Swiss-Prot record, chain A:
Family indicated by similarity: Belongs to the peptidase M10A family.
Protein name per Swiss-Prot or TrEMBL: Collagenase 3
Region (Interaction with TIMP2): 73-143
Triggers of expression: Up-regulated by TNF and IL1B.
Quaternary state and interactors: Monomer. Interacts with TIMP1, TIMP2 and TIMP3. Binds (via the C-terminal region) to collagen.
Residue sites binding Ca(2+) 3 per the record: 76-77, 79, 81, 99, 102
Name of the gene encoding the protein in the UniProt record: MMP13
Residues reported in the UniProt entry to bind Ca(2+) 1: 25, 100, 102
Description of its domains: The conserved cysteine present in the cysteine-switch motif binds the catalytic zinc ion, thus inhibiting the enzyme. The dissociation of the cysteine from the zinc ion upon the activation-peptide release activates the enzyme.
Record: residues binding Zn(2+) 2: 119, 123, 129, 137
Tissue expression summary: Detected in fetal cartilage and calvaria, in chondrocytes of hypertrophic cartilage in vertebrae and in the dorsal end of ribs undergoing ossification, as well as in osteoblasts and periosteal cells below the inner periosteal region of ossified ribs. Detected in chondrocytes from in joint cartilage that have been treated with TNF and IL1B, but not in untreated chondrocytes. Detected in T lymphocytes. Detected in breast carcinoma tissue.
């Protein structure tokens, strides 16, 4: 027999990502900075490294879309679903999609892109939702400096080990 | 904290299903019985329970359709692809689609809905195809029921045996 195997973790430490397109709500540089900082959340406590590609295929393809956007997991307009990401694997595996019917910001006016991305990239690296209300990986959004909670540190190091 | 399960499986033992629509080929009662019997194939050898919903959102949505029917796996008219089902997961995960350009039966003619459904539900629960030509999860249709051991071992590797007796 065969079951559907789940790439619990990336079998490689050096991963690439690409920002495929951009939300209207923030400057290109603000978006790039938020995503860079969201990966650094994870790379800071593991041996994982992330390098940005500007074209072609990367392990982690990042994009903004609305409603049905090419994976049959449609978004739902403002509020509700904010973003989703696929667990590690080929093709859509690892990819992160953000609902461009939300208002994204570098601040508190709408949804903080950095924080949601940080959460999403946790899914891209193999983490599930946490039960701990204080965990970044908790399924509920809440809003200058960010410290990865111990619950998330333990979860990700259980997959990849410490840096 | 939680890491993604090693294998694609449902994290709860109580699952729901919904028959969204019906083939022209069989009565509602015939279709209902075939699907009920197909779920029992798997509930009998695990701790899984399946409850039917008449509407709303179920874990396993069952529908008949033809050609393009709302996913990346369009059917192809009579013959060829008969049906497919998505592995455990959010939204369409678990869902099972039957090509309504086929002839569905409760006999040995055409395609026996019960047998194709039991196979599809194996996919809905996290089984891929087997290389064992006697397995229910073997990828080619043949008409015959007792769940083969290759499939029992497969499904129990995921969910355990439930009550062994
Ligand atoms: C006659 N058509 C088929 O057998 C095609 N089968 C299916 O689409 C399909 C879905 C369910 C099954 C199936 C497989 C084995 C058993 Cl014991 C019962 C049902 O098969 C298959 C044929 C090989 C190429 C892929 C599609
Ligand atoms: Ca990818
Ligand atoms: Ca939304
Ligand atoms: Ca927007
Ligand atoms: Ca067909
Ligand atoms: Ca479903
Ligand atoms: Ca038909
Ligand atoms: Zn998406
Ligand atoms: Zn999440
Ligand atoms: Zn389909
Ligand atoms: Zn199959």
């Amino acid at each position: 027999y065969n079951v559907f195997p789940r790439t619990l973790k990336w079998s490689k430490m050096n991963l690439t990502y690409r920002i495929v397109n951009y939300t209207p709500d923030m400057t290109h540089s603000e978006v790039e900075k938020a995503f860079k900082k969201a990966f650094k959340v994870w790379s800071d406590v593991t041996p994982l490294n992330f390098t940005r590609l500007h074209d072609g295929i990367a392990d982690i393809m990042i994009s903004f879309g609305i409603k049905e956007h090419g994976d049959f997991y449609p978004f739902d307009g403002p509020s509700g679903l904010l973003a989703h990401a696929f667990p590690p694997g080929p093709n859509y595996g690892g990819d992160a999609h953000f609902d461009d019917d939300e208002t994204w910001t570098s601040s508190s006016k709408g949804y903080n892109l950095f924080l949601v991305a940080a959460h999403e990239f946790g899914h891209s690296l193999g983490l599930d939702h946490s039960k701990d209300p204080g965990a970044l990986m908790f399924p509920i959004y809440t809003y200058s400096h960010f410290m990865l909670p111990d619950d998330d540190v333990q979860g990700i190091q259980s997959l990849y080990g410490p840096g």
